[PDB]
Paper text:
In contrast, CRL4Cdt2 recognizes Cdt1 when bound to the proliferating cell nuclear antigen (PCNA) trimer, through a binding motif (PIP box) in its N-terminal end. Unexpectedly, we found a PIP box in the C-terminal end of Cdt2, and showed that it directly mediates interaction of Cdt2 with PCNA.
Remarkably, the affinity of the Cdt1PIP peptide to PCNA (7, 200 ± 200 nM) is two orders of magnitude weaker than that for the Cdt2PIP, and similar to what is reported for other peptides derived, for example, from the pol-δ p66 and FEN1 (1–60 μM). To confirm the binding mode of the Cdt2PIP and Cdt1PIP peptides to PCNA, we determined the crystal structure of both complexes by X-ray crystallography, to a 3.5- and 3.4-Å resolution, respectively. The binding mode of both the peptides was very clear (see the Materials and Methods section for details). Both peptides bind in a similar manner to other PCNA complex structures. The Ile709 and Val7 side chains occupy a similar space in the hydrophobic recognition pocket. In addition, weaker affinity of Cdt1 PIP box can help to release Cdt1 after poly-ubiquitination, whereas CRL4Cdt2 could remain on PCNA to trap the next substrate, leading to an efficient degradation cycle of substrates.
Numbering used by the authors:
A (entry chain A): 1 to 186, 191 to 255
B (entry chain H), E (entry chain I), F (entry chain G): 4 to 13
C (entry chain C): 1 to 185, 191 to 255
D (entry chain B): 1 to 255
The structure:
């Protein structure tokens, strides 16, 4: 069997909001070490990489490794039926092709208990090895969303330029063009830049907007860029795991 | 536009 | 004439939100004893039964019994033009085919005053008798709405099963299926007066239209018996009640 | 050059909400006396008359008069990218066909800096002459919105009747009809919560609600609104922009 | 689905 | 619905 219980249920609702809108299907890799999901969106331009360490669950049992194929829309519609304060427990009969979720209202004498069909899905995972990056920007996840949405009223693509001093997001449009300069600040409200060498890259906003759906998962977000290689937008899921989004640049 | 299927494989 | 003044106006807005979406037309039965509306929705599957005792109005005059035929959509659009704190007064010239509503702002020395055409409608409705029921569940009206909406993401029809211990709402669907168990636990409480166990199946389509009454009451009571209609009763504190009847299946 | 800095940025966002939905294009008249916009909507039934006195800006430089042709939709989409507490600075190279806006977050971190293309706009502005009006009604701007929206559920057109006693908005419709009477108010506890009527002689006029509803988009600019009517001449719906200017809307009556 | 017409009558 | 065209000039 596999059985994981999460006292802060809301984490799992917040996760499936971030994803359901970017990827319909996805293969959950269950193991001792915890829960790993990696998918590309249907365009093959963005890539999602969820990690929930087993450590960060109140209860975690898992006898064999599973590959649970989940329609994320189906699973979102179900987590919609879970209160934010609810204590969510996933359970999968190993010898079964269905996944059970149990929501206990933190009290007694109310218990929702849903059960969703699983599908076969080829976990052909991609390779992502961890790297030194040229620029890393840590900033409030709000301010990153606020920026990405605001430049969408201007242009299709944002140019992210990064120095020691600060970081500059730029968009050109039909109507005009616009520039947002964040400076580095001297506790999650802070903007900070670990910088090997300057980077300027262009990314589709279309996509960065789907990523900021993860904004209610973390105080802060970190952006890791290098010359002509994918942007990594990493939302920390405090004391539990992380949700990394990879976007390919242009020219 | 480019692909993220360009950097990482099997 | 007939002339009733209601100091808590919001009650009358809240009522017409519950109804307007379920029934376009409806006959108001006016009398000494107060205001009685009973209608079925156009499908003949649900039935609404509003009662406002005359005693719960600040003023209440009514010379003979009337049958005022009201398009409830028309009357909703008008009560939308009444502030929540407003003091609503209905007035119908007996010798007239129009109904007047007057909204006095309790503060602002401002007074809205609308006037809406009535229609002829057969007041000759159904004879729902009062009954001992097998199960009665009292629960927060919020939690009943929260439940009915949540199972709508799953299935068409809910199965309401009722024991001593508690009550269980169950739905099957395309994507999966689910079960919500309330156990027995002033208005925050869940409680079950139970003669014998009942399990019945109802369309959620409809229970969702009923929960539009959820802002009328802290609590709702569900009364079921074997192969006879569910009664979803919203109390309208110290004024009357709004009972919804839904027929079960197979 | 021209360069104006406004410490309360939100005023300029609030303005462009009122306008953008009524008028796509519009010619801003810049001068030492300040910023003047006058446009009709494309139907020629309503007319907008914005004034922002130079006085009411924290900084105001302006060497020659400009006529900046602005697509207001474009300029709304840009002021949407300005936080409410942000310190907005307009700058226009006179010898340039672009207008620059700079939003400084008053606290910390960050400075947005947009730049929007201008258009050539020969706009025949009209000559509204100042007049004694028959009726003037000052009332809370909220209560005027609350009224205009409520009668929209009833009818197309409102009849505004005005005596010494009070003022009465009336609408007829398919479903029924309605009347809202405001009385004149002494015993308040707020100067802005009051309804008051300087009245030379009684007036009754008919106006399209379609339009009065676009006007009430200015409701977050002022505690109060004043209505000025006279027999067979336009209604003036005037929103005061405290210590800064005013936004006047003119609507033509019927028959 | 039964009709609620079926259980009670005029 | 008379218009403002015909109340003010140029």
């Amino acid at each position: 069997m596999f059985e994981a219980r999460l006292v802060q249920g809301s984490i799992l609702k917040k996760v499936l909001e971030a994803l359901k809108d970017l990827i319909n299907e996805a293969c959950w890799d269950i193991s001792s070490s915890g829960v790993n999901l990696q998918s590309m969106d249907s365009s093959h331009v963005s890539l999602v990489q969820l990690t929930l360490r087993s450590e960060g669950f109140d209860t975690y049992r898992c006898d064999r490794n599973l590959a649970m194929g989940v329609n994320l829309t189906s699973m979102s519609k179900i987590l919609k039926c879970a209160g934010n304060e609810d204590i969510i427990t996933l359970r999968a009969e190993d010898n079964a092709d269905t996944l059970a979720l149990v929501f206990e209202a933190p009290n007694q004498e109310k218990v929702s208990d849903y059960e969703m069909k699983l599908m076969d899905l080829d976990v052909e995972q991609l390779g992502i090895p961890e790297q030194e990056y040229s620029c890393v920007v840590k900033m409030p996840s709000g301010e990153f969303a606020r920026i990405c949405r605001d430049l969408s009223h201007i242009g299709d693509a944002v140019v992210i330029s990064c120095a020691k001093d600060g970081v500059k997001f730029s968009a050109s449009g039909e109507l005009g063009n616009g520039n947002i300069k964040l400076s580095q600040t001297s506790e999650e409200e802070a903007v900070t830049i670990e910088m090997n060498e300057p980077v300027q890259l262009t990314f589709a906003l279309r996509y960065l907007n789907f990523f900021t759906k993860a904004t209610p998962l973390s105080s802060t977000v970190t952006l890791s860029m290098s010359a002509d290689v994918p942007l990594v937008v990493e939302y920390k899921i405090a004391d539990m795991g992380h949700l990394k989004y990879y976007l390919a640049p242009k020219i | 536009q480019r692909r993220v299927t360009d950097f990482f494989a099997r």
